[PDB]
Amino acid sequence: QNITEEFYQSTCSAVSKGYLSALRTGWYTSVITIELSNIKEPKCNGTDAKVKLIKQELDKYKNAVTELQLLMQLGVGSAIASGVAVSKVLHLEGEVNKIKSALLSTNKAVVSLSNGVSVLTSKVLDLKNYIDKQLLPIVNKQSCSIPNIETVIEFQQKNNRLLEITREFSVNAGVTTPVSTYMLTNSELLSLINDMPITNDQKKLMSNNVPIVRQQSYSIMSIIKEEVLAYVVQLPLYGVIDTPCWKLHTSPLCTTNTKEGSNICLTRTDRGWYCDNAGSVSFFPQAETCKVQSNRVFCDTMNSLTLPPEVNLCNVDIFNPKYDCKIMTSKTDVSSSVITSLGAIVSCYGKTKCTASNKNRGIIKTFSNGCDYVSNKGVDTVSVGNTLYYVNKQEGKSLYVKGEPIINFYDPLVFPSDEFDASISQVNEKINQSLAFIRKSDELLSAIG
Amino acid sequence: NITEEFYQSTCSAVSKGYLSALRTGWYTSVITIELSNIKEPKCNGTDAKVKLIKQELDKYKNAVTELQLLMQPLGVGSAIASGVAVSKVLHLEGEVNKIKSALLSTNKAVVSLSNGVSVLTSKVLDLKNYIDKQLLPIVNKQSCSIPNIETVIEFQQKNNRLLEITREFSVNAGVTTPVSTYMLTNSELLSLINDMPITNDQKKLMSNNVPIVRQQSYSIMSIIKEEVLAYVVQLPLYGVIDTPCWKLHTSPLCTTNTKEGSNICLTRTDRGWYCDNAGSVSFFPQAETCKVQSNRVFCDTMNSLTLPPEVNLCNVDIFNPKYDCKIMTSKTDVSSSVITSLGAIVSCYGKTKCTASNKNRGIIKTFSNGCDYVSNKGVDTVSVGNTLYYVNKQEGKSLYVKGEPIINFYDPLVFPSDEFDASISQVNEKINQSLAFIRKSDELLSAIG
Amino acid sequence: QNITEEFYQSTCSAVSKGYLSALRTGWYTSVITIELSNIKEPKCNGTDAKVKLIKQELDKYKNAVTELQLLMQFPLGVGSAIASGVAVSKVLHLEGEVNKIKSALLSTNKAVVSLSNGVSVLTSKVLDLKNYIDKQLLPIVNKQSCSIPNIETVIEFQQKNNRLLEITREFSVNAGVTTPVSTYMLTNSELLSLINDMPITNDQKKLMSNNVPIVRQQSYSIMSIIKEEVLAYVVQLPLYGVIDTPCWKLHTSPLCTTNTKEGSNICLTRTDRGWYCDNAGSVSFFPQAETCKVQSNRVFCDTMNSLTLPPEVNLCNVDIFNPKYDCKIMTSKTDVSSSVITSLGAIVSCYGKTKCTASNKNRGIIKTFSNGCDYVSNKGVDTVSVGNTLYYVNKQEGKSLYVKGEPIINFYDPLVFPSDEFDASISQVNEKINQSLAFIRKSDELLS
Amino acid sequence: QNITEEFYQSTCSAVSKGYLSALRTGWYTSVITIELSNIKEPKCNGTDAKVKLIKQELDKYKNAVTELQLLMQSGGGGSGGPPFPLGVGSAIASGVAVSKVLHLEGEVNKIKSALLSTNKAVVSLSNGVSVLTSKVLDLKNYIDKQLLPIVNKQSCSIPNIETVIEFQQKNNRLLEITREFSVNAGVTTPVSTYMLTNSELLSLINDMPITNDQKKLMSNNVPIVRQQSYSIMSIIKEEVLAYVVQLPLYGVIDTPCWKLHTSPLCTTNTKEGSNICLTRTDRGWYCDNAGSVSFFPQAETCKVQSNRVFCDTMNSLTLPPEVNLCNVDIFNPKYDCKIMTSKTDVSSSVITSLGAIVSCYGKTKCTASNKNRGIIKTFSNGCDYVSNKGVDTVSVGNTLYYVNKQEGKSLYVKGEPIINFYDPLVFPSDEFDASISQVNEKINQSLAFIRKSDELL
């Protein structure tokens, strides 16, 4: 493999490349079912120790049932419209029954619902069969033939799943992310992925990264009726796979020459993850949304902006004519560090002491005032002020790109020092507007001399 | 049962499993309408029913008048030359009389005409009977009996077919295709199919695909003389049937190696329908010259090429030695899509958006730059740029043939880049030529010592 | 509306601007039904003339029903237009669906119905031959003794049956899919009622309602099923997702040199002629002339017959040598006189001894053309005459402008000009010229 | 359940009306106790398998108790546990106050006596605060009776498998309670069924001193109540474990609410940087509240059921009702509508209660489509609105959004986008926060400077 990183001394930024995309574009929903002997209710004259335990469990099971019935009843959207769509179909009368019939002969079917959706169906727990067979004869009459100890233990363990489904939805109000292991066993998810109408490339991918698939899935609680508990599991579908990705890291760029509170600072405002997606670039500004396993980036495109491919030119030539590169400005000469994919960017301003260091021989570099970068080869920690940032130790090849820090090119009298969201062109229009005051208030003075 | 293979090497796909029905020849039959001779009313009465009956007389008379005017890499065919031959004989002296002689006592007979043209003939409407027995009796006398009201209504209905046949001929120079229920009702068309020198399975074939027969038939106005209207119907004769047909779709195949249009492009040009036929392959290159009902394929051999069965090897290995697969080359860096029988070929080039999507799930593939394929297995639409295509949803078995796109074997500087219809060998002729020059004139530059 | 045209003297091509888009991007399907009576040929042993006329029409109805039962069983791309409406057709083929629509319509003639593959469609009962036959016609003729029918019953049944036969006739020669959707398939009032009931914006309703003929052209009628005494056929209507974006039309004509020795000229023709409409930040390009239909200043096109181009395609009109987009051209040596009549003008390519003329209906010849590519507005011009061909100029009113400049065929050296290129570009010709220059200069340094 | 929505073209913003308030206005706190055994660690020699299992389960019980002691001393749960103009609260401030009273003298004993013949009582504390008090678990009774004569003696008597099993289950709730606390420094949200079973919480809701309408609202929306409730570890002493539970109190109910969605409003009149932008910034939830309008600007301090909006006023501002006049005329006289300006030409879509807002700028593929019909509108540059009338998705670039398919009626209010009235040569585009009037000033300043400057030249 190859993950590489370039550091642009001119812009105090770093682009780390070599990653492969896997972006969520679509959803697949499936219906999961637990089938309950709700009909059950215990009464009998027997009072063995082993009887009490089964009666206690029946109250637990019967409680979870009654509670579950009460519980039944930036770019903005709703993530779970697909699952809620299947949930509302399930409430149509007999739609639940279609599932029961299909799941009579095996525990995994493909039922086509009334809205023309063909969805995987799984029975994952058969509590009606266990109770009605091994339990109901025990506690229906009064002579209440006492069970063996293994039935006390077995019913208790089967009932455990149902109890922690109900615990989950007493605090989640029906919708969880990630979908939990009681919601769906890892073994069941693996069998679901194996049965999904997708490429064999996708199936291998979803199986390799089940933990990621969990975090990007939704459990949506649907119905309890006709002795069936049904909930929808909504899984990610990655339409984009193996396009190039790259991550942008950005730190402030300031003037060190002035030795006061008055200095101009400029920063690339467009950091985050980047992906090629259908002839454009999908950009994820909250890099908190993109999970990375190995060199693969798993993002949900619902959290992206779509940008023209020319945005990549702000990493080559920040002053290019083709893309209006976005920057911010401030007058805060504050030192900080940004740990990158296999390196570290340091901005060191003021009287702060900035260290690069190695766990075998202590301090191995002192930083000048200004913006600098070090590779993760021969550096373990980077210290800025009272902060010790450890550095990522993933293997890869780093590169230092030398250039004049572009903050030097700006003339501090006329610099718009407090631009929150501006660009390279927005800043020059502000500069030239300020020189407009300069020529006009000057040659007005040249009327009397 | 329809199957499909997509060859990724050559950006093409074959749809197998269809059954031939090829137009081998023609069957020409003569259709007669018996007409009373024009007798202008010569009657004075002014009841509204006489006015109405006279009005319909002039529609009839001005229709006989209109028909009197009317009577007086591929090959290049003459479609109705078969039917016109029969029409030409009827124009002869004493031939229309032969039709009358054989049709006094039947509504159908086989008549010998002078040129050895012995053709079946049918009398389909007898207006001379109706006019001379019921109508002009009242209206040809100097003072006219004023008619039945039901005679007014019935005469209009009887005359309707004669008027409509005249209209169809009058706006079509006398030749009509498809053949309508006015030239030939479905009752008579089925009757004629019962009496052709075809095998019974061919009689069944036509009698079930009657719309197809009509589309491929002609109706040639021939003569109006001797109280007789006659026109020639030309019905297709399907002499080769139930033999295997496969359809070849092809799409452009280009390198994406460089950006900014430095690419070379290659496209198979043999796209169309192929059918086994008497030890050869009939090739129909204009997929409109074929119709498809169910898994059947009605093609017209007149628009066909006869190819040796070795042409099929181009689908197996495009660099086979026996057949020289027709290819074209250009630099067309545009995106396109072909809907196959149970899939879609996508040739996504440049920076276009190309996706396959499912109606309930959303985007499920996002194609990379190059030639790919999706099957209708869980795919409902393909979108290329702004164009949205719908895939066929028939039940089928589609196989992806992995291989290397042969546009990469070719060097981008030896490539004859604008050849309309060359072959693999004709290009390798020009690669061999353009190569041989450079090595010589570069080795000629060696001996400057 | 304001229409403008510019003639680019440098590329022998004019661009008409100012049209307004209506690009069909999706389909809507409706199920149109005719409720039938399906009663057998009658046992009434009767002879009166009004009985005979009724029997003739009944066997017309029977034959039409049986005729319908037997019905069932270049840089561009390729699709199936009716694939959307064939979805709904085969939903109907499943038992249960026909009963659904029958229940929804036995009390009212218009409905919204949810078919079981997940589609909600408007459905209409347009003709009810069941209850007419069963209550006016079946009574008197299902008995061996026939009551003689009324005459106005004979006239009316023949009128009602007429639509069923006409729809049968249309389906019978068109394999069961028809375009345009006739007035027998859907009368004008029924269409405007559908348009009202569509879940479309209140603007698209105005567009379709005021362009009913064009909606007919880009629509389909799909014969679907007969059973349960119900005839149903699916009607598929255009949905113009793109509306009122700017559109423009590009006209092109061969641009050649004029120097005189027959067989010693190089030619060069822009090849991107067709319709262009702005569409979702790109340019949809309709290179087939037939596909786009122009009514008023509006251009109706089917997006499935289009190629999507980067917006920089438009720069080919202001600068064919532009850095960004490689403009598509073809070359040759075969130069003939020919004219292209534009939206509000005419391009004349006059070459050789051919005489070329523009003339007014009163002033006679108002222009005589020089050899080479030229233009003339439709202002005070009625006909253009190139050789023995007389073209008429369009008399649409609009403003036009003559962008003067040097024909680019002049810049090219005839002795290296690639004169065979069929589908080439400005840059492809540039590559081939630089190549042929090098070969000649290669042999020059390899003569020394 | 008549949800309706209007879209204002002039300001690029839609309002959903017809929701019902359920506002959290205050807190109810109740004390919950678990009786504990002061059992010393097993004192006997025993090696039977079942003696081992009971010994282990006692250690889990004993360890969990010293763990809970570690919480109640180091800290004790007593903690201090926002956008542009908002305030800053202290959620557990109410509950911790009751937690500290329990550390006083005899307040533990008042409860212990008050919960002797019952397991639910009312205690009036040493400060006059009357709190419901519930004993949920009695481990002292079980450990001392069924469990102590085994461990007490010099040689352990072997227990049953049933005693081994039943103790594992009685012990369980105490351990899970200790787990939750040990991982949260003794303050937990939401309140779990371990902290408080649905049986206990619905019984607790009934006994509370609140209206009948409040009881109905709370007893139905149990998960929302759990999400909005805190559980504060308080004290372990006196052989009693007691923790405070802080429940939301809905003092405002059934008043009308509405939600405002906004999007950028950018001039399309030019190419690339020449465009200038306006955007309303008062988006969020509004509810009529005591003749004022409570504004919830983070719409996710609110949770939404059918028709019903559960907001928390700690994240609210209080506004005069004239604020709604911003949704009929952004240039109104009474209230100064707050906006923001920029030069940011990137497309964006908002999903509303029953519609979609699309801000298509530059060259994005902005599109709204249907499951079975395909694209039913391609947006052109500007700010447009589509309802969910047979609309299932909206695509902006590569991003697919699903429209709300809520059943309701939608109104498109036509108007001139106000961004077209502003002179782009003298327009201010820095404003993180500004009002309509504040922008008119900065334009009055600039245009009146050129009044004087035109004079002198």
Side-chain angles (χ1 to χ4, degrees), chain C residues 28 100-101 104-105 108 110-115 119-124 197 199:
Chain C
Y28 183 102
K100 289 177 184 237
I101 304 169
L105 283 170
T108 184
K110 204 78 213 93
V112 178
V113 185
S114 288
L115 305 191
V119 56
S120 288
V121 283
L122 281 142
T123 70
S124 181
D197 295 337

Side-chain angles (χ1 to χ4, degrees), chain B residues 91-303:
Chain B
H91 274 265
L92 268 187
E93 164 137 3
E95 297 299 325
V96 50
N97 307 130
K98 291 178 182 170
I99 302 286
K100 285 166 75 78
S101 300
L103 283 174
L104 285 172
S105 323
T106 28
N107 287 344
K108 177 171 284 194
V110 165
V111 162
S112 148
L113 302 185
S114 267
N115 239 30
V117 203
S118 279
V119 315
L120 166 80
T121 70
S122 308
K123 184 169 50 177
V124 306
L125 170 66
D126 191 10
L127 276 177
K128 171 160 148 323
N129 192 3
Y130 186 77
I131 282 149
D132 298 301
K133 308 268 139 203
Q134 290 249 320
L135 209 75
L136 213 25
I138 70 202
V139 159
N140 204 37
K141 305 170 329 214
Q142 78 94 336
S143 94
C144 18
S145 323
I146 59 102
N148 213 19
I149 187 61
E150 301 97 332
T151 290
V152 170
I153 278 175
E154 180 177 55
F155 181 41
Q156 294 184 347
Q157 266 193 8
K158 256 194 167 296
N159 212 32
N160 172 65
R161 188 177 196 190
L162 176 74
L163 309 173
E164 293 299 334
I165 291 167
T166 307
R167 293 194 172 112
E168 289 197 1
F169 278 158
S170 218
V171 294
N172 282 297
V175 164
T176 69
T177 165
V179 177
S180 61
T181 59
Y182 277 153
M183 321 308 292
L184 207 68
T185 45
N186 227 62
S187 330
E188 317 162 359
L189 177 47
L190 283 159
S191 97
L192 248 59
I193 296 173
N194 242 339
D195 311 322
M196 298 204 317
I198 34 170
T199 72
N200 272 349
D201 286 42
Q202 283 151 232
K203 282 192 189 170
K204 192 186 64 182
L205 194 81
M206 298 199 213
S207 295
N208 286 336
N209 300 271
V210 186
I212 309 274
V213 168
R214 291 182 172 274
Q215 289 194 302
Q216 298 183 330
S217 307
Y218 296 80
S219 211
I220 297 103
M221 164 67 194
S222 188
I223 61 158
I224 186 165
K225 62 182 288 206
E226 317 244 341
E227 302 174 84
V228 173
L229 162 58
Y231 51 96
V232 165
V233 167
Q234 194 185 302
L235 305 163
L237 219 70
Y238 301 103
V240 152
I241 271 189
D242 288 342
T243 65
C245 295
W246 61 102
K247 180 174 187 177
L248 173 84
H249 323 83
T250 66
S251 212
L253 163 63
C254 305
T255 44
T256 37
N257 285 29
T258 320
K259 310 312 287 172
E260 309 317 11
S262 289
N263 325 58
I264 66 193
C265 293
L266 176 144
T267 316
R268 305 233 281 131
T269 88
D270 25 4
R271 157 193 343 130
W273 272 104
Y274 290 72
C275 295
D276 272 317
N277 187 0
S280 303
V281 181
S282 283
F283 171 51
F284 309 91
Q286 321 157 6
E288 62 91 338
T289 177
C290 293
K291 331 283 186 182
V292 177
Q293 307 275 145
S294 173
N295 67 345
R296 212 159 253 297
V297 172
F298 296 80
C299 297
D300 210 310
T301 66
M302 167 148 71
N303 295 319

Side-chain angles (χ1 to χ4, degrees), chain D residues 369-411:
Chain D
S369 63
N370 184 289
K371 271 181 173 304
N372 314 298
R373 291 198 262 268
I375 304 170
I376 76 141
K377 176 189 234 314
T378 301
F379 298 96
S380 51
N381 282 10
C383 167
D384 212 351
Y385 175 81
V386 69
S387 67
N388 49 350
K389 78 238 298 183
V391 169
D392 300 314
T393 77
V394 180
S395 297
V396 202
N398 309 324
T399 318
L400 204 154
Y401 302 103
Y402 293 87
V403 169
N404 199 322
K405 308 245 78 184
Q406 186 147 66
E407 294 246 73
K409 324 255 154 223
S410 177
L411 169 47

Side-chain angles (χ1 to χ4, degrees), chain C residues 173-184:
Chain C
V173 316
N174 276 293
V177 185
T178 71
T179 204
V181 193
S182 46
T183 65
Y184 278 135

